[PDB]
Amino acid sequence: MRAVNWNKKEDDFSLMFWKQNIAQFWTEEEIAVSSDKNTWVQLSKEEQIAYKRVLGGLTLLDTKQGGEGMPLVLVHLENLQAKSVLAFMGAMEEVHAKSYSHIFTTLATEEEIDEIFDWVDTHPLLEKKAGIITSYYRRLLKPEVTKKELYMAMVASVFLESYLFYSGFFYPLYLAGQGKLTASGEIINLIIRDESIHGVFVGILAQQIFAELSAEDQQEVQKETQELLMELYEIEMAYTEEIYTSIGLVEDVNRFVRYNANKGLMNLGLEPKFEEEEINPIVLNGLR
Amino acid sequence: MRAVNWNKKEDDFSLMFWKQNIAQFWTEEEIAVSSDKNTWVQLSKEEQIAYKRVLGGLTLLDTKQGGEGMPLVLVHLENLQAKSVLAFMGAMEEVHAKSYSHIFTTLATEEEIDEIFDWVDTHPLLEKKAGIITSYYRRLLKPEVTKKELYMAMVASVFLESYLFYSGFFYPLYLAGQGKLTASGEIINLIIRDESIHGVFVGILAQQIFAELSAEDQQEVQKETQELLMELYEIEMAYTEEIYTSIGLVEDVNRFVRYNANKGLMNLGLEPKFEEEEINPIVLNGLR
Ligand SMILES: [Mn+2]
Ligand SMILES: [Mn+2]
Ligand SMILES: [Mn+2]
Ligand SMILES: [Mn+2]
Protein backbone atom coordinates (compact mmCIF):
# COMPACT_ATOMS: atom_id res chain seq x y z
CA MET A 1 0.00 0.00 0.00
CA ARG A 2 1.37 3.37 -1.08
CA ALA A 3 2.41 6.24 1.19
CA VAL A 4 2.48 9.80 -0.10
CA ASN A 5 6.02 10.65 -1.29
CA TRP A 6 6.55 14.34 -1.94
CA ASN A 7 10.07 13.60 -3.26
CA LYS A 8 8.51 12.17 -6.46
CA LYS A 9 5.98 14.50 -8.08
CA GLU A 10 2.69 12.91 -9.13
CA ASP A 11 1.79 16.00 -11.19
CA ASP A 12 3.09 19.47 -11.98
CA PHE A 13 0.71 21.51 -9.80
CA SER A 14 -0.17 19.82 -6.48
CA LEU A 15 2.91 21.14 -4.66
CA MET A 16 2.25 24.74 -5.65
CA PHE A 17 -1.40 24.50 -4.58
CA TRP A 18 -0.41 22.80 -1.33
CA LYS A 19 1.98 25.64 -0.55
CA GLN A 20 -0.53 28.32 -1.58
CA ASN A 21 -3.34 26.90 0.53
CA ILE A 22 -1.03 26.83 3.58
CA ALA A 23 0.22 30.34 2.79
CA GLN A 24 -3.38 31.56 2.79
CA PHE A 25 -4.23 29.92 6.12
CA TRP A 26 -6.34 32.06 8.46
CA THR A 27 -8.94 31.70 11.19
CA GLU A 28 -11.81 33.92 12.31
CA GLU A 29 -10.07 35.09 15.49
CA GLU A 30 -7.83 37.22 13.27
CA ILE A 31 -10.64 39.62 12.21
CA ALA A 32 -12.72 41.21 14.94
CA VAL A 33 -16.06 42.28 13.55
CA SER A 34 -17.50 44.33 16.44
CA SER A 35 -16.73 47.61 14.65
CA ASP A 36 -19.27 46.65 11.97
CA LYS A 37 -22.09 47.27 14.45
CA ASN A 38 -21.94 51.02 13.75
CA THR A 39 -22.92 50.53 10.10
CA TRP A 40 -25.06 47.44 10.72
CA VAL A 41 -27.59 49.40 12.73
CA GLN A 42 -27.83 51.97 9.94
CA LEU A 43 -29.10 49.41 7.43
CA SER A 44 -32.80 49.09 6.90
CA LYS A 45 -34.75 46.12 8.18
CA GLU A 46 -34.93 44.78 4.61
CA GLU A 47 -31.16 45.16 4.10
CA GLN A 48 -30.39 43.37 7.38
CA ILE A 49 -32.69 40.48 6.50
CA ALA A 50 -31.07 40.09 3.07
CA TYR A 51 -27.60 40.05 4.65
CA LYS A 52 -28.48 37.42 7.24
CA ARG A 53 -30.22 35.23 4.67
CA VAL A 54 -27.32 35.28 2.21
CA LEU A 55 -24.85 34.45 5.03
CA GLY A 56 -27.06 31.52 5.98
CA GLY A 57 -26.97 30.23 2.42
CA LEU A 58 -23.19 30.61 2.25
CA THR A 59 -22.87 28.63 5.49
CA LEU A 60 -24.96 25.83 4.00
CA LEU A 61 -22.80 25.59 0.88
CA ASP A 62 -19.57 25.54 2.91
CA THR A 63 -21.07 22.93 5.28
CA LYS A 64 -21.74 20.63 2.34
CA GLN A 65 -18.41 21.26 0.60
CA GLY A 66 -16.37 20.52 3.70
CA GLY A 67 -18.47 17.58 4.85
CA GLU A 68 -19.35 15.85 1.54
CA GLY A 69 -17.76 17.43 -1.53
CA MET A 70 -14.11 17.48 -0.63
CA PRO A 71 -14.08 14.20 1.37
CA LEU A 72 -15.90 12.12 -1.23
CA VAL A 73 -13.92 13.44 -4.19
CA LEU A 74 -10.63 13.01 -2.40
CA VAL A 75 -11.25 9.44 -1.25
CA HIS A 76 -11.50 8.36 -4.91
CA LEU A 77 -8.34 10.08 -6.12
CA GLU A 78 -5.36 7.96 -7.00
CA ASN A 79 -2.99 10.93 -6.80
CA LEU A 80 -1.94 11.12 -3.16
CA GLN A 81 -0.48 14.62 -3.43
CA ALA A 82 -3.72 15.99 -4.89
CA LYS A 83 -5.64 14.12 -2.16
CA SER A 84 -3.55 16.01 0.40
CA VAL A 85 -4.48 19.34 -1.16
CA LEU A 86 -8.21 18.51 -1.19
CA ALA A 87 -8.08 17.46 2.48
CA PHE A 88 -6.66 20.84 3.42
CA MET A 89 -9.23 22.65 1.24
CA GLY A 90 -12.05 20.77 2.99
CA ALA A 91 -10.75 21.83 6.38
CA MET A 92 -10.72 25.42 5.17
CA GLU A 93 -14.40 25.13 4.18
CA GLU A 94 -15.07 24.34 7.84
CA VAL A 95 -13.03 27.42 8.85
CA HIS A 96 -15.17 29.46 6.44
CA ALA A 97 -18.39 28.07 7.86
CA LYS A 98 -17.30 28.88 11.39
CA SER A 99 -16.36 32.43 10.37
CA TYR A 100 -19.97 33.05 9.30
CA SER A 101 -21.08 32.14 12.84
CA HIS A 102 -18.52 34.66 14.10
CA ILE A 103 -20.16 37.38 12.00
CA PHE A 104 -23.64 36.30 13.14
CA THR A 105 -22.63 36.61 16.81
CA THR A 106 -21.91 40.32 16.31
CA LEU A 107 -24.89 41.08 14.04
CA ALA A 108 -27.70 39.19 15.74
CA THR A 109 -29.16 37.84 18.96
CA GLU A 110 -29.02 34.12 19.76
CA GLU A 111 -32.74 33.84 18.95
CA GLU A 112 -32.31 35.70 15.65
CA ILE A 113 -29.42 33.42 14.69
CA ASP A 114 -31.32 30.24 15.37
CA GLU A 115 -34.20 31.71 13.32
CA ILE A 116 -31.86 32.17 10.35
CA PHE A 117 -30.58 28.59 10.58
CA ASP A 118 -34.18 27.29 10.72
CA TRP A 119 -34.99 29.43 7.67
CA VAL A 120 -32.00 27.88 5.88
CA ASP A 121 -32.97 24.30 6.74
CA THR A 122 -36.58 24.73 5.58
CA HIS A 123 -35.88 26.84 2.51
CA PRO A 124 -37.12 25.15 -0.69
CA LEU A 125 -34.61 26.75 -3.11
CA LEU A 126 -31.59 26.18 -0.86
CA GLU A 127 -32.73 22.60 -0.31
CA LYS A 128 -33.12 22.12 -4.07
CA LYS A 129 -29.77 23.73 -4.93
CA ALA A 130 -27.81 21.88 -2.29
CA GLY A 131 -29.55 18.62 -3.18
CA ILE A 132 -28.58 18.97 -6.84
CA ILE A 133 -24.91 19.44 -5.95
CA THR A 134 -24.72 16.82 -3.23
CA SER A 135 -26.41 14.20 -5.43
CA TYR A 136 -23.19 14.10 -7.46
CA TYR A 137 -21.15 13.68 -4.31
CA ARG A 138 -23.35 10.98 -2.80
CA ARG A 139 -23.03 8.98 -6.01
CA LEU A 140 -19.44 8.39 -4.79
CA LEU A 141 -20.57 6.49 -1.65
CA LYS A 142 -19.55 3.15 -3.12
CA PRO A 143 -16.24 1.29 -3.42
CA GLU A 144 -15.97 1.50 -7.22
CA VAL A 145 -16.87 4.64 -9.16
CA THR A 146 -16.60 5.41 -12.83
CA LYS A 147 -14.58 8.29 -14.20
CA LYS A 148 -17.83 9.84 -15.47
CA GLU A 149 -19.14 9.88 -11.88
CA LEU A 150 -15.92 11.31 -10.45
CA TYR A 151 -15.70 13.91 -13.24
CA MET A 152 -19.26 15.07 -12.60
CA ALA A 153 -18.63 15.31 -8.85
CA MET A 154 -15.65 17.56 -9.69
CA VAL A 155 -17.85 19.62 -12.05
CA ALA A 156 -20.44 20.02 -9.28
CA SER A 157 -17.64 21.06 -6.91
CA VAL A 158 -16.30 23.68 -9.33
CA PHE A 159 -19.79 25.01 -9.88
CA LEU A 160 -20.30 25.31 -6.09
CA GLU A 161 -16.86 26.96 -5.53
CA SER A 162 -16.78 29.28 -8.55
CA TYR A 163 -20.47 30.03 -9.17
CA LEU A 164 -23.08 29.08 -6.57
CA PHE A 165 -21.46 31.06 -3.74
CA TYR A 166 -21.54 34.32 -5.67
CA SER A 167 -25.24 35.20 -5.42
CA GLY A 168 -24.46 35.36 -1.68
CA PHE A 169 -20.95 36.90 -1.81
CA PHE A 170 -22.42 39.81 -3.82
CA TYR A 171 -24.05 41.50 -0.89
CA PRO A 172 -21.18 41.60 1.64
CA LEU A 173 -18.94 42.89 -1.16
CA TYR A 174 -21.51 45.47 -2.27
CA LEU A 175 -21.89 46.83 1.25
CA ALA A 176 -18.12 46.76 1.92
CA GLY A 177 -17.51 48.64 -1.33
CA GLN A 178 -19.58 51.45 0.22
CA GLY A 179 -17.75 51.35 3.57
CA LYS A 180 -20.50 49.35 5.28
CA LEU A 181 -19.75 46.18 7.24
CA THR A 182 -16.11 46.37 6.16
CA ALA A 183 -14.78 43.87 8.72
CA SER A 184 -17.25 41.21 7.64
CA GLY A 185 -16.26 42.16 4.09
CA GLU A 186 -12.62 41.44 4.95
CA ILE A 187 -13.63 37.96 6.10
CA ILE A 188 -15.63 37.34 2.92
CA ASN A 189 -12.60 38.46 0.91
CA LEU A 190 -10.43 35.87 2.72
CA ILE A 191 -13.05 33.25 1.93
CA ILE A 192 -13.17 34.25 -1.75
CA ARG A 193 -9.37 34.12 -1.94
CA ASP A 194 -9.64 30.49 -0.82
CA GLU A 195 -12.62 29.50 -2.99
CA SER A 196 -10.95 30.93 -6.08
CA ILE A 197 -7.96 28.62 -5.75
CA HIS A 198 -10.26 25.73 -4.75
CA GLY A 199 -12.18 26.08 -7.99
CA VAL A 200 -9.04 26.34 -10.09
CA PHE A 201 -7.50 23.24 -8.52
CA VAL A 202 -10.57 21.02 -8.74
CA GLY A 203 -11.03 22.21 -12.34
CA ILE A 204 -7.49 21.05 -13.17
CA LEU A 205 -8.25 17.63 -11.68
CA ALA A 206 -11.48 17.49 -13.67
CA GLN A 207 -9.72 18.30 -16.94
CA GLN A 208 -7.21 15.52 -16.27
CA ILE A 209 -10.01 12.98 -15.81
CA PHE A 210 -11.90 14.30 -18.82
CA ALA A 211 -8.87 13.61 -21.05
CA GLU A 212 -8.99 9.90 -20.04
CA LEU A 213 -12.65 9.42 -20.94
CA SER A 214 -13.72 7.80 -24.18
CA ALA A 215 -15.19 10.13 -26.79
CA GLU A 216 -18.65 8.72 -26.03
CA ASP A 217 -18.23 9.40 -22.32
CA GLN A 218 -16.82 12.87 -23.02
CA GLN A 219 -19.93 13.70 -25.05
CA GLU A 220 -22.14 12.45 -22.22
CA VAL A 221 -20.47 14.47 -19.47
CA GLN A 222 -20.31 17.60 -21.66
CA LYS A 223 -24.08 17.35 -22.02
CA GLU A 224 -24.55 16.74 -18.29
CA THR A 225 -22.28 19.70 -17.49
CA GLN A 226 -24.16 22.17 -19.71
CA GLU A 227 -27.50 20.93 -18.40
CA LEU A 228 -26.29 21.23 -14.78
CA LEU A 229 -25.05 24.78 -15.44
CA MET A 230 -28.52 25.81 -16.60
CA GLU A 231 -30.42 23.82 -13.96
CA LEU A 232 -28.45 25.70 -11.34
CA TYR A 233 -28.91 29.00 -13.22
CA GLU A 234 -32.70 28.70 -13.14
CA ILE A 235 -32.50 28.07 -9.38
CA GLU A 236 -30.08 30.98 -8.88
CA MET A 237 -32.37 33.38 -10.73
CA ALA A 238 -35.28 32.35 -8.50
CA TYR A 239 -33.04 32.78 -5.43
CA THR A 240 -31.83 36.25 -6.37
CA GLU A 241 -35.40 37.32 -7.07
CA GLU A 242 -36.44 36.12 -3.60
CA ILE A 243 -33.50 37.64 -1.69
CA TYR A 244 -32.87 40.89 -3.50
CA THR A 245 -36.22 42.17 -4.86
CA SER A 246 -36.93 43.91 -1.52
CA ILE A 247 -33.72 45.96 -1.87
CA GLY A 248 -33.74 46.56 -5.62
CA LEU A 249 -30.58 44.63 -6.56
CA VAL A 250 -31.86 41.62 -8.55
CA GLU A 251 -30.43 42.48 -11.97
CA ASP A 252 -27.06 43.51 -10.50
CA VAL A 253 -26.72 40.21 -8.68
CA ASN A 254 -27.78 38.29 -11.77
CA ARG A 255 -25.00 39.95 -13.77
CA PHE A 256 -22.55 38.93 -11.06
CA VAL A 257 -23.85 35.33 -11.04
CA ARG A 258 -23.33 35.10 -14.80
CA TYR A 259 -19.81 36.52 -14.59
CA ASN A 260 -18.85 33.90 -12.04
CA ALA A 261 -20.57 31.09 -13.91
CA ASN A 262 -18.29 31.95 -16.82
CA LYS A 263 -15.31 31.71 -14.46
CA GLY A 264 -16.46 28.26 -13.32
CA LEU A 265 -16.69 27.14 -16.93
CA MET A 266 -13.19 28.50 -17.61
CA ASN A 267 -11.88 26.60 -14.59
CA LEU A 268 -13.19 23.45 -16.30
CA GLY A 269 -11.53 24.36 -19.59
CA LEU A 270 -14.88 25.26 -21.17
CA GLU A 271 -16.01 28.25 -23.19
CA PRO A 272 -18.09 30.96 -21.48
CA LYS A 273 -21.85 30.69 -21.91
CA PHE A 274 -23.02 34.16 -20.82
CA GLU A 275 -22.24 37.44 -22.52
CA GLU A 276 -19.28 39.30 -21.07
CA GLU A 277 -20.23 42.18 -18.77
CA GLU A 278 -18.18 44.24 -16.34
CA ILE A 279 -18.51 43.54 -12.62
CA ASN A 280 -20.63 45.95 -10.60
CA PRO A 281 -18.24 48.81 -9.75
CA ILE A 282 -19.12 48.91 -6.06
CA VAL A 283 -18.58 45.15 -5.78
CA LEU A 284 -15.22 45.67 -7.46
CA ASN A 285 -14.35 48.27 -4.82
CA GLY A 286 -15.46 45.78 -2.15
CA LEU A 287 -12.95 43.28 -3.55
CA ARG A 288 -10.21 46.01 -3.51
CA MET B 1 -30.78 20.84 4.59
CA ARG B 2 -28.88 21.93 7.72
CA ALA B 3 -25.94 24.34 7.90
CA VAL B 4 -23.46 24.18 10.78
CA ASN B 5 -24.54 26.66 13.48
CA TRP B 6 -21.90 27.24 16.14
CA ASN B 7 -24.32 29.47 18.10
CA LYS B 8 -26.19 26.32 19.21
CA LYS B 9 -23.87 23.68 20.67
CA GLU B 10 -24.47 20.15 19.37
CA ASP B 11 -22.38 18.65 22.20
CA ASP B 12 -20.23 19.80 25.12
CA PHE B 13 -16.76 19.22 23.62
CA SER B 14 -16.53 19.89 19.85
CA LEU B 15 -15.86 23.61 20.27
CA MET B 16 -13.01 23.05 22.72
CA PHE B 17 -11.44 20.49 20.38
CA TRP B 18 -11.92 22.80 17.39
CA LYS B 19 -10.14 25.58 19.23
CA GLN B 20 -7.33 23.29 20.41
CA ASN B 21 -6.70 21.80 16.97
CA ILE B 22 -6.44 25.33 15.51
CA ALA B 23 -4.24 26.46 18.39
CA GLN B 24 -1.87 23.60 17.61
CA PHE B 25 -1.64 24.43 13.89
CA TRP B 26 1.85 24.13 12.42
CA THR B 27 3.54 23.22 9.14
CA GLU B 28 6.94 21.75 8.34
CA GLU B 29 8.36 25.06 7.11
CA GLU B 30 8.58 26.11 10.77
CA ILE B 31 11.30 23.57 11.71
CA ALA B 32 14.52 23.43 9.72
CA VAL B 33 16.02 19.96 9.91
CA SER B 34 19.41 20.43 8.23
CA SER B 35 21.23 20.69 11.57
CA ASP B 36 20.31 17.03 12.20
CA LYS B 37 22.85 15.94 9.56
CA ASN B 38 25.68 16.20 12.08
CA THR B 39 24.16 13.58 14.36
CA TRP B 40 22.72 11.56 11.45
CA VAL B 41 26.24 10.74 10.27
CA GLN B 42 27.15 9.56 13.78
CA LEU B 43 24.63 6.72 13.43
CA SER B 44 25.40 3.34 11.93
CA LYS B 45 23.92 2.02 8.69
CA GLU B 46 21.63 -0.20 10.76
CA GLU B 47 20.37 2.70 12.88
CA GLN B 48 19.79 4.87 9.80
CA ILE B 49 17.89 2.08 8.06
CA ALA B 50 15.64 1.54 11.08
CA TYR B 51 14.94 5.29 11.26
CA LYS B 52 14.05 5.55 7.57
CA ARG B 53 11.86 2.43 7.71
CA VAL B 54 9.86 3.56 10.72
CA LEU B 55 9.35 7.00 9.13
CA GLY B 56 8.09 5.25 6.00
CA GLY B 57 5.60 3.31 8.10
CA LEU B 58 4.42 6.46 9.86
CA THR B 59 3.94 8.14 6.48
CA LEU B 60 1.76 5.24 5.32
CA LEU B 61 -0.46 5.42 8.40
CA ASP B 62 -0.90 9.20 8.09
CA THR B 63 -1.62 8.80 4.37
CA LYS B 64 -4.46 6.39 5.14
CA GLN B 65 -5.82 8.40 8.07
CA GLY B 66 -5.99 11.65 6.10
CA GLY B 67 -7.15 10.03 2.88
CA GLU B 68 -9.63 7.44 4.17
CA GLY B 69 -10.13 7.34 7.94
CA MET B 70 -11.08 10.91 8.71
CA PRO B 71 -13.02 11.54 5.46
CA LEU B 72 -15.16 8.43 5.62
CA VAL B 73 -15.90 8.71 9.33
CA LEU B 74 -16.74 12.39 9.09
CA VAL B 75 -19.05 11.98 6.11
CA HIS B 76 -21.34 9.73 8.20
CA LEU B 77 -21.45 11.88 11.33
CA GLU B 78 -24.70 13.70 11.99
CA ASN B 79 -23.10 16.23 14.35
CA LEU B 80 -21.91 19.04 12.09
CA GLN B 81 -19.61 20.58 14.70
CA ALA B 82 -17.81 17.26 15.30
CA LYS B 83 -17.63 16.79 11.53
CA SER B 84 -15.82 20.14 11.31
CA VAL B 85 -13.27 19.01 13.88
CA LEU B 86 -12.62 15.75 12.01
CA ALA B 87 -12.12 17.60 8.71
CA PHE B 88 -9.42 19.73 10.30
CA MET B 89 -7.79 16.68 11.89
CA GLY B 90 -7.69 14.97 8.49
CA ALA B 91 -5.91 17.97 6.98
CA MET B 92 -3.37 17.82 9.78
CA GLU B 93 -2.66 14.17 8.94
CA GLU B 94 -1.64 15.39 5.49
CA VAL B 95 0.59 18.07 7.11
CA HIS B 96 2.18 15.27 9.15
CA ALA B 97 2.81 13.12 6.08
CA LYS B 98 4.39 16.03 4.27
CA SER B 99 6.63 16.75 7.29
CA TYR B 100 8.07 13.22 7.04
CA SER B 101 9.01 13.99 3.45
CA HIS B 102 10.78 17.14 4.71
CA ILE B 103 12.85 15.02 7.08
CA PHE B 104 13.65 12.49 4.34
CA THR B 105 14.96 15.24 2.05
CA THR B 106 17.59 16.15 4.63
CA LEU B 107 18.53 12.58 5.61
CA ALA B 108 18.60 10.77 2.26
CA THR B 109 19.26 11.06 -1.45
CA GLU B 110 16.36 11.04 -3.91
CA GLU B 111 17.19 7.46 -4.92
CA GLU B 112 17.33 6.35 -1.27
CA ILE B 113 13.97 8.01 -0.61
CA ASP B 114 12.26 6.31 -3.50
CA GLU B 115 13.74 3.00 -2.26
CA ILE B 116 12.18 3.55 1.16
CA PHE B 117 8.77 4.24 -0.36
CA ASP B 118 9.04 1.11 -2.50
CA TRP B 119 9.97 -0.86 0.64
CA VAL B 120 6.85 0.56 2.32
CA ASP B 121 4.57 -0.30 -0.58
CA THR B 122 5.79 -3.92 -0.84
CA HIS B 123 6.16 -4.61 2.87
CA PRO B 124 3.89 -7.49 3.98
CA LEU B 125 3.38 -6.46 7.61
CA LEU B 126 2.66 -2.83 6.73
CA GLU B 127 0.27 -4.05 4.04
CA LYS B 128 -1.48 -6.34 6.53
CA LYS B 129 -1.73 -3.71 9.30
CA ALA B 130 -2.95 -0.97 6.99
CA GLY B 131 -5.35 -3.36 5.29
CA ILE B 132 -6.95 -4.37 8.58
CA ILE B 133 -7.54 -0.75 9.55
CA THR B 134 -8.72 0.46 6.16
CA SER B 135 -11.15 -2.47 5.77
CA TYR B 136 -13.23 -0.85 8.52
CA TYR B 137 -13.09 2.50 6.72
CA ARG B 138 -13.99 1.05 3.36
CA ARG B 139 -17.11 -0.54 4.82
CA LEU B 140 -18.35 3.07 5.04
CA LEU B 141 -18.37 3.45 1.22
CA LYS B 142 -22.14 3.17 0.99
CA PRO B 143 -25.01 5.63 1.24
CA GLU B 144 -26.13 4.59 4.73
CA VAL B 145 -24.06 2.87 7.38
CA THR B 146 -25.11 1.15 10.57
CA LYS B 147 -24.01 2.46 13.92
CA LYS B 148 -22.07 -0.80 14.43
CA GLU B 149 -20.10 -0.10 11.23
CA LEU B 150 -19.45 3.50 12.23
CA TYR B 151 -18.41 2.49 15.74
CA MET B 152 -15.89 -0.08 14.46
CA ALA B 153 -14.42 2.47 12.04
CA MET B 154 -13.95 4.83 15.02
CA VAL B 155 -12.33 2.00 17.02
CA ALA B 156 -9.95 1.33 14.13
CA SER B 157 -9.19 5.05 13.95
CA VAL B 158 -8.42 5.29 17.67
CA PHE B 159 -6.21 2.19 17.42
CA LEU B 160 -4.31 3.80 14.54
CA GLU B 161 -4.00 7.20 16.28
CA SER B 162 -3.21 6.00 19.78
CA TYR B 163 -1.45 2.69 19.25
CA LEU B 164 -0.26 1.71 15.77
CA PHE B 165 1.87 4.84 15.29
CA TYR B 166 3.90 4.19 18.43
CA SER B 167 6.14 1.32 17.27
CA GLY B 168 7.39 3.98 14.84
CA PHE B 169 7.38 7.06 17.10
CA PHE B 170 9.57 5.13 19.55
CA TYR B 171 12.78 5.49 17.57
CA PRO B 172 12.74 9.25 16.82
CA LEU B 173 11.94 9.81 20.50
CA TYR B 174 14.69 7.43 21.67
CA LEU B 175 17.30 9.18 19.53
CA ALA B 176 16.08 12.67 20.48
CA GLY B 177 16.26 11.64 24.14
CA GLN B 178 19.94 10.98 23.50
CA GLY B 179 20.45 14.36 21.77
CA LYS B 180 20.43 12.88 18.24
CA LEU B 181 18.20 14.07 15.38
CA THR B 182 16.66 16.60 17.73
CA ALA B 183 15.10 18.79 15.03
CA SER B 184 13.33 15.81 13.50
CA GLY B 185 12.42 14.94 17.10
CA GLU B 186 10.77 18.35 17.50
CA ILE B 187 8.64 17.58 14.43
CA ILE B 188 7.69 14.13 15.75
CA ASN B 189 6.70 15.74 19.05
CA LEU B 190 4.36 18.17 17.21
CA ILE B 191 2.85 15.21 15.39
CA ILE B 192 2.36 13.29 18.66
CA ARG B 193 0.71 16.35 20.25
CA ASP B 194 -1.81 16.24 17.41
CA GLU B 195 -2.37 12.47 17.38
CA SER B 196 -2.97 12.47 21.14
CA ILE B 197 -5.92 14.83 20.81
CA HIS B 198 -7.12 13.04 17.64
CA GLY B 199 -7.36 9.79 19.57
CA VAL B 200 -9.13 11.39 22.52
CA PHE B 201 -11.69 13.07 20.29
CA VAL B 202 -12.51 10.10 18.10
CA GLY B 203 -12.69 8.02 21.29
CA ILE B 204 -15.34 10.37 22.71
CA LEU B 205 -17.37 10.05 19.51
CA ALA B 206 -17.00 6.26 19.66
CA GLN B 207 -18.23 6.08 23.25
CA GLN B 208 -21.27 8.16 22.25
CA ILE B 209 -22.16 5.81 19.39
CA PHE B 210 -21.55 2.74 21.56
CA ALA B 211 -24.06 3.94 24.16
CA GLU B 212 -26.65 4.30 21.37
CA LEU B 213 -26.36 0.65 20.19
CA SER B 214 -28.71 -2.17 21.12
CA ALA B 215 -27.40 -4.60 23.71
CA GLU B 216 -26.86 -7.26 21.04
CA ASP B 217 -24.86 -4.85 18.89
CA GLN B 218 -22.84 -3.74 21.93
CA GLN B 219 -21.87 -7.31 22.74
CA GLU B 220 -20.82 -7.86 19.09
CA VAL B 221 -18.61 -4.80 18.81
CA GLN B 222 -17.10 -5.28 22.30
CA LYS B 223 -15.87 -8.68 21.21
CA GLU B 224 -14.71 -7.45 17.80
CA THR B 225 -12.78 -4.58 19.44
CA GLN B 226 -10.87 -6.94 21.76
CA GLU B 227 -10.15 -9.31 18.87
CA LEU B 228 -8.93 -6.41 16.74
CA LEU B 229 -6.65 -5.14 19.52
CA MET B 230 -4.96 -8.52 19.71
CA GLU B 231 -4.86 -9.11 15.93
CA LEU B 232 -2.99 -5.83 15.60
CA TYR B 233 -0.78 -6.68 18.61
CA GLU B 234 0.40 -9.89 16.92
CA ILE B 235 1.30 -7.92 13.79
CA GLU B 236 3.03 -5.18 15.82
CA MET B 237 5.19 -7.73 17.64
CA ALA B 238 6.28 -9.16 14.28
CA TYR B 239 6.97 -5.62 13.02
CA THR B 240 9.07 -4.62 16.00
CA GLU B 241 11.11 -7.82 15.73
CA GLU B 242 11.79 -7.09 12.06
CA ILE B 243 12.70 -3.40 12.49
CA TYR B 244 14.53 -3.36 15.80
CA THR B 245 16.39 -6.68 16.19
CA SER B 246 19.40 -5.24 14.33
CA ILE B 247 19.79 -2.44 16.91
CA GLY B 248 18.83 -4.35 20.07
CA LEU B 249 15.65 -2.46 20.99
CA VAL B 250 12.84 -4.98 20.44
CA GLU B 251 11.72 -5.46 24.04
CA ASP B 252 11.92 -1.70 24.76
CA VAL B 253 9.71 -0.93 21.78
CA ASN B 254 7.26 -3.67 22.74
CA ARG B 255 6.86 -2.14 26.19
CA PHE B 256 6.13 1.24 24.59
CA VAL B 257 3.59 -0.35 22.23
CA ARG B 258 1.72 -1.92 25.15
CA TYR B 259 1.72 1.39 27.06
CA ASN B 260 0.11 3.14 24.11
CA ALA B 261 -2.34 0.31 23.41
CA ASN B 262 -3.59 0.83 26.95
CA LYS B 263 -3.98 4.54 26.19
CA GLY B 264 -6.02 3.74 23.08
CA LEU B 265 -8.28 1.49 25.12
CA MET B 266 -8.75 4.24 27.72
CA ASN B 267 -9.61 6.70 24.94
CA LEU B 268 -12.42 4.27 24.05
CA GLY B 269 -13.60 4.05 27.66
CA LEU B 270 -12.20 0.53 27.99
CA GLU B 271 -10.03 -1.06 30.65
CA PRO B 272 -6.30 -1.52 29.97
CA LYS B 273 -5.29 -4.96 28.74
CA PHE B 274 -1.53 -4.85 29.28
CA GLU B 275 0.40 -4.71 32.53
CA GLU B 276 1.46 -1.26 33.67
CA GLU B 277 5.08 -0.28 33.07
CA GLU B 278 6.70 3.15 33.19
CA ILE B 279 7.83 4.78 29.95
CA ASN B 280 11.43 4.09 28.97
CA PRO B 281 13.44 6.95 30.55
CA ILE B 282 15.27 7.84 27.33
CA VAL B 283 11.99 8.03 25.41
CA LEU B 284 10.59 10.17 28.22
CA ASN B 285 13.50 12.59 27.79
CA GLY B 286 12.80 12.67 24.04
CA LEU B 287 9.20 13.66 24.75
CA ARG B 288 10.20 16.72 26.84
MN1 LIG C 1 -15.49 27.83 1.73
MN1 LIG D 1 -13.98 26.07 -1.35
MN1 LIG E 1 -0.91 12.32 11.78
MN1 LIG F 1 -4.18 11.71 13.81
Numbering used by the authors:
A (entry chain A), B (entry chain B): 1 to 288
Q: Can you quote the paper on this entry?
A:
Ribonucleotide reductase (RNR) is a key enzyme in all domains of life, utilizing radical chemistry for the synthesis of deoxyribonucleotides by substitution of the 2′ OH-group of a ribose 5′phosphate with a hydrogen. The strictly aerobic class I RNRs are comprised of two homodimeric subunits: a large catalytic subunit R1, where ribonucleotide reduction takes place, and a small radical-generating subunit R2. R2a proteins utilize an oxygen-activated di-ferrous metal site to generate a stable FeIII/FeIII-tyrosyl radical (Y·) cofactor, whereas R2b proteins generate a MnIII/MnIII-Y·. R2c proteins generate a MnIV/FeIII cofactor and the recently discovered class R2d—a MnIV/MnIII cofactor. These dimetal centers reside in a ferritin-like scaffold, and are coordinated by two histidine residues and four carboxylate ligands.
Here we show that the class Ib ribonucleotide reductase R2 protein from Bacillus anthracis spontaneously assembles a Mn/Mn cofactor in vitro, under both aerobic and anoxic conditions, when the metal-free protein is subjected to incubation with MnII and FeII in equal concentrations. To study metal selectivity and cofactor assembly from a mixed MnII and FeII pool in the presence and absence of O2, in the present study we describe apoprotein crystal soaking experiments, subjecting apo BaR2b to a large excess of both MnII and FeII in aerobic and reducing anoxic conditions (in presence of 30 mM sodium dithionite). Site-specific metal quantification by X-ray anomalous dispersion on WT BaR2b revealed that the two sites of the metal center predominantly bind Mn irrespective of the presence or absence of O2 in the experimental setup. Unlike R2lox and R2c, wild-type BaR2b is able to select Mn over Fe in both binding sites. The capability to exclude Fe appears central for a protein requiring a di-Mn cofactor for function. If Mn binds in both positions, neither the wild-type nor the L61G reacts with O2.
